[PDB]
Ligand binder design. Sequence first.
Ligand code: HEM
Ligand SMILES: *Cc1c(COP(=O)(O)O)cnc(C)c1O
Length: 488
Amino acid sequence: QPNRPSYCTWELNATNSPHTCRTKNGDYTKIMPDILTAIGQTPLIKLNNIPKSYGIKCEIYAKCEFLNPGGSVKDRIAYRMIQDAEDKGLLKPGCTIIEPTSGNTGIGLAMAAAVRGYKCIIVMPEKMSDEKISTLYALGAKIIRTPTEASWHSPEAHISVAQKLQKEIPNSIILDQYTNPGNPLAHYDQTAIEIWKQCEGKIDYLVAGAGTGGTISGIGRKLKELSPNIKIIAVDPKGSILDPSSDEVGFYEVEGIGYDFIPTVLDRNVIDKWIKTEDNESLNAARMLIRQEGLLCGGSSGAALIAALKIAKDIPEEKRMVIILPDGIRNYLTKFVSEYWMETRGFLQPVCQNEMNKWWWNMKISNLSFDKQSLLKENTVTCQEAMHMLKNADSQLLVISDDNIHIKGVISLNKLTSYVISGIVKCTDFVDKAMVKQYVKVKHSATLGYISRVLEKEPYVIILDDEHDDAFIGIVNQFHILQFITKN
Ligand code: HEM
Ligand SMILES: *Cc1c(COP(=O)(O)O)cnc(C)c1O
């Protein structure tokens, strides 16, 4: 159980500790034996334009963890845990490392396992995040998929099934970044020390986001031991219970911060204040870091920046603040880096490039007229019949609904062909097995410029009725847009 209470007896400035102490990971001045020894020693860069544009009088330095060789801060822990395991004899050559995370920790453990010749197996359902799949497959990791709906309570969830797979595979191990002292200890021993030395002893506030609390708790313990007056600020997104002030749990786009449980490695006694963030301000702040500061970073970095800017309004000029930037743009290239993805989610407004289009740009989809496709029921149509229908369909998609009103899922030719070839779906089986539960849905009241912008990637868009119970209306493609534009 990752949510169990911690048994750690540490108190401030305590001497004798059972844990290992790793000061430095390697020496850049001479030849390094492996890429893992290059983890850490990341630069602390000043923010120049962003704080002065926001009227902040004090100094703000970003510790860049996207410059680690794996691309994230998680390298630090992925090494450390493994290291400690190897000193306990738990890790042998030929061992298989299993971790229940879809985040950057899987990439760190995949890289370290590649260096050490360990098999690596990562468990994540569906796609929560993508472009990390290519990186994990490139590093030699096996990826196991589960149902994405199952809560971490459910056995179908990635954690429980990760333990089941651990029991199935002989002589395997789970490092469990949530319960592992190596996670906070890596930042206690190294990250916090690097920040302390680089600041030359002058540091006042430290802002970081906590997914697992490892970073903020390790740096909080070490820095609070070195500088008792330091203020440690944690950043949690809306929809996560990590904040001691909470209440339900929501859905946010920003990856890497917040959880629906309270990890063991997170020590909330060293957290002075919690700041809550939203996807919009966070992601636009990350784009702001990239644009104004030339720092290529992820969304959690933007969340850190927004929290720090909220706190720093009244902070006097002589103080220094340090914020942690956990990872880089690599994973997010198609999500918050893309203007299309930003305008789709509503985080940016689509701009009308040609003034000729100005008349139909703000018109609603309601002015359009398109077919309302019959909603098929559950467990009726065989795939043969659905091959026929998809061939004959206007927009070449099928709609499956149990309620006859709201659309439960969709059927596409690509998913169907994938499942038929892989053997998951026999020809005479039911198409509901190949159903796609995630899909693009747009309110009936949206403007035609938004729809035309979304259609540049998605060939189809499901229109739902915002006034009555998100009721299914019809499917819209670029044919309807051209037909509305040209015939005026
Ligand atoms: C003098 C310093 C410290 C002492 C005396 C101490 C004591 C302990 C002990 C005895 C355990 C064993 C838990 C068990 O047997 O179930 C433990 C676990 C742990 N320690 Fe420490 N510790 C110290 C420093 C630290 C530091 C600096 C960190 C993080 C930066 C840390 C993080 C943890 C964590 C996350 C656990 C896991 C708790 C669990 O497994 O339930 N400790 N600690
Ligand atoms: C893990 C992670 C965090 C949070 O780091 P913690 O050690 O969980 O406090 C923030 N951003 C990203 C991208 C992460 O992977």
